[PDB]
Amino acid sequence: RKGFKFSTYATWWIRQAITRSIADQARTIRVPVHMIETINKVNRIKRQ
DNA sequence: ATTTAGCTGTATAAACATTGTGTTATTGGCGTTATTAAGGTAACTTGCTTAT
Secondary structure, three states, X not given: OOOOOXXXXXXXXXXXHHHHHHHHHOOOOOOOHHHHXXXXXXXXXXXX
């Protein structure tokens, strides 16, 4: 009904799924996704 | 015979024993705060890497 390309709607869902999969199976020991995101933000701040 | 020394008797005394009583303490319980997971989000990027 809205006039827009479907690629962006598909892209957001694909990106969310990939990030979630990486966090869930990223390490042999399961680590919380919220804990992982804060660690990623801290690492980016340290790099800057 | 007499008593004397011997013997510890059992009450008593003392110690224990038993009873009772207090105390406390911990389980349970409840709720509680730390934690946490998932859902959802939509300009666009629509056959890869990855390698002696």
